[PDB]
Every structure is written in structure tokens, then in C-alpha cells.
Design a protein around this ligand. Structure first.
Ligand code: IIM
Ligand code: 87B
Length: 350
């Protein structure tokens, strides 16, 4: 067991192995606290995340287990994975803190869009990387569910990774009621219209891509009703085929209660944009989740011809999500998490 040292930063207590030096706060929130640090063992700059109250409730405990299981699984250039995971606890009994370690990423798209638009060539590269990462995630039957600029980390050389994936599993219970994530959420997950699949994430990508090309939020709704209004203004009110598949009577009632909207010509809306980009946007921003383009299909779109390589767009090992259906106690989840900490094999430095 390594030598730990203690430190207070922004009122948060950090206890980490000595190999991690020069801890510097990069952000905090509900998810937890992140510090940038220097890993003296490897020479690499890293981000260290301390989980907030990992075992405060069953939901917290289950969420903690979930995140650790997810991060241990992710082995892809466009998805954050685990360099290390540690606790300062010496046994299960005193285990109440979890720290996660990944390669440091300078920024996110939330602040790369700054408040200006990108070039078409830059967008191509960023969206390509998002899609390549989503292909991998989707292949393991993992759905992000809350993809947005702030959870896409980017380097100074414009290399991109998805973070906070697979954790949008709150379901009903709000408490955490977060906002401004509705802007990128697919209609069917926000309003629980119809059966939802992996292409909930493609909708988000469509919204992100739109925003990078124009410098504007595509659908800046102030609530669920406003949000849907803004969406239907662009894509048009559901046709015959799609109305039939709406499982909710309330939703279906509401849609049909609204003044009918035509689908707009995207060439008009996205005026001046690369017509390959517009075409891809058309395929991404379709209400019918059965007809929305998939990650793998999006990668093969001609918009990405400069980057697409079917021999280097890998899929994921099988991921066991059976734990998700289980109703266990705090101490069970917490013990399952501890097991996962102990069994963590550091990835080879090469
Ligand atoms: C506010 S939004 O919900 C949100 C959620 C998580 C993060 C967020 N989580 C991490 C993060 C760090 C380490 C780790 F092991 C897992 C995740 C990072 C991170 C990773 C690498 N370099 C810089 C920062 N950012 C950021 C924003
Ligand atoms: O899960 S990871 O893929 N692990 C991993 C471990 C060691 C690595 N060293 C290198 C360099 C390329 C030659 C040396 N990439 C490496 C990748 C991963 C990648 C990025 C962030 C977190 C986790």
C-alpha cells in the first residue's frame, strides 16, 4: 500500500498517494470534485476525481458501483478510462471514499464553442471522434443518455473524449433536478414518447454539431414544453407512421393538440454550411428513433471521408449490466465497490 498524504482544497479533504503531486482544483459539483495533478510514476498529467458521499444512500452506493464498473470497462481513445482507482481506507469497515484517475484533458466543448463558431474541418474531426466513441459505447449496450458539450473533454490538440457516460439512470426521483441539459436531450427520452434506443445519443450529437457550425444553441428551451415547441418548429410535427408508435396517450394527445408544423428545409436553416454536414444533420435530427442514423452508420457518411477507417473504429468487449436490476443494501453495494477497487489491474504503461 502506498504512502498517502492529506490536504484541504476548497474545503474538500483530499487524501491521495504521494505519486500524485501538485493537486490543483479544476471543478466541483454534484458528481464530485476533480483535481488536476502530476503523476510522478509515469510523468503524465492526470485528473483525480473524488466521489462525493459515495455511500450516503442506496442510490449513491449503486451509482458509485455503476461509475466504477463503467470506467473500468472503457478502453477506447475517445472515452475516458481508468489509469488508477484508490481509497485511503485499509479495510472494508473504514471504506467511505473513492478516488478515480484518468488522463488530464484541458477543456470541454462547452468552452471551446467559447461563444464563436468553429470551422467545418474542425467540426468534422470533433464530431467524428464523438461518433467513434459512441460506436464503442453503444456496442456494449451502454447508452450515455445525457450527452452535451460539458461532458465532452478536449485536449489542446483537439483530441476528444466522452465522460459521464452510462450514469443518466436517475429515473423519476428529481432532487438533482438539473437544467440546460434539456437542450440536447432526444424528444423521446425527455417526454417518454416511445421506446428509446442508443440513438437518443445521436440526437444529442446532432444538436452539438449544429451548435458548433452556427455558434447558437439549436433548441434553447426554457422547459419541456418550450423545448418540444422549438424541436417541432424545425423537424415538423409527427407524421402518420410516427404518431402510431407513441405509447403515451398524454403525449400523443398533446402533440395532436398543437398547430401542425411542416418540416423545414435544413439547407435553409443551416445556411452556408457544408451540404454534407446539413445532410448528416438531417439524418440525425429525426423524431422517429427507429429511423435515426446510428453511430456506425454516421461514421460511414461522406462528411467523414477524411477520417473514416472501418479497420480503426473498434467495438467494446461485452459489458455485464445485470447489477442494474438488483435491489441491494448500502453495505452490499459498498462491498461490491470495494471488491472492484481491490481487483483493479492498472493498465500497462505501454
Ligand atoms: C458539470 S458536468 O456534469 C461534468 C461532469 C464531470 C466532469 C469531469 N469528470 C472528470 C473525471 C476525472 C477523473 C475521472 F477518473 C473520471 C472523470 C473530468 C475530467 C477528466 C479529465 N480531465 C479533466 C477533467 N471532468 C466534468 C463536467
Ligand atoms: O484505459 S486507457 O486506454 N489506458 C492507457 C494506459 C496507459 C497508456 N499509455 C499510453 C501511451 C500510448 C503509448 C503510451 N496510452 C495509454 C492508455 C486510458 C487512456 C487514457 C486515459 C485513461 C485511460
Amino acid at each position: 500500500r502506498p504512502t498517502f498524504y492529506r490536504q484541504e482544497l476548497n474545503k474538500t479533504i483530499w487524501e491521495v498517494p504521494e505519486r500524485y503531486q501538485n493537486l490543483s482544483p479544476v471543478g466541483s459539483g454534484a458528481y464530485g470534485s476533480v483535481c488536476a495533478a502530476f503523476d510522478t510514476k509515469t510523468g503524465h498529467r492526470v485528473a483525480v476525481k473524488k466521489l462525493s458521499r459515495p455511500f450516503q444512500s442506496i442510490i449513491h452506493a449503486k451509482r458509485t458501483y455503476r461509475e466504477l464498473r463503467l470506467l473500468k470497462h472503457m478502453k477506447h481513445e475517445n472515452v475516458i478510462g481508468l489509469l488508477d482507482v484508490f481509497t485511503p481506507a485499509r479495510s472494508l469497515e473504514e471504506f467511505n471514499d473513492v478516488y478515480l484517475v484518468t488522463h488530464l484533458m484541458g477543456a470541454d466543448l462547452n468552452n471551446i464553442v467559447k461563444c464563436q463558431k468553429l470551422t467545418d474541418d474542425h467540426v468534422q474531426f470533433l464530431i467524428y471522434q464523438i461518433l467513434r466513441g459512441l460506436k464503442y459505447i453503444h456496442s456494449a449496450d451502454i447508452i450515455h443518455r445525457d450527452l452535451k458539450p460539458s461532458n465532452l473533454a478536449v485536449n489542446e490538440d483537439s483530441e476528444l473524449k466522452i465522460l459521464d457516460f452510462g450514469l443518466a439512470r436517475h429515473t423519476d426521483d428529481e432532487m438533482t433536478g438539473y437544467v440546460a441539459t434539456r437542450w440536447y436531450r432526444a424528444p423521446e427520452i425527455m417526454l417518454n414518447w416511445m421506446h428509446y434506443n442508443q440513438t437518443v445519443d445521436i440526437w444529442s450529437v446532432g444538436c452539438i454539431m449544429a451548435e458548433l457550425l452556427t455558434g447558437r444553441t439549436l433548441f434553447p428551451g426554457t422547459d419541456h414544453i418550450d423545448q418540444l415547441k422549438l424541436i417541432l418548429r424545425l423537424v415538423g410535427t409527427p407524421g402518420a407512421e410516427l404518431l402510431k408508435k407513441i405509447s403515451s396517450e398524454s403525449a400523443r394527445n398533446y402533440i395532436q393538440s398543437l398547430a401542425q408544423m411542416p418540416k423545414m428545409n435544413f439547407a435553409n436553416v443551416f445556411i452556408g454550411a457544408n451540404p454534407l454536414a446539413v445532410d448528416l444533420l438531417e439524418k440525425m435530427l429525426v423524431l422517429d428513433s427507429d429511423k435515426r442514423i446510428t453511430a456506425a452508420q454516421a461514421l460511414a457518411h461522406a462528411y467523414f471521408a477524411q477520417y473514416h477507417d472501418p479497420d480503426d473504429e473498434p467495438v467494446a468487449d461485452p459489458y455485464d449490466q445485470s447489477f442494474e436490476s438488483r435491489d441491494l443494501l448500502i453495505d452490499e453495494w459498498k462491498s461490491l465497490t470495494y471488491d472492484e477497487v481491490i481487483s483493479f489491474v492498472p493498465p500497462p504503461l505501454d
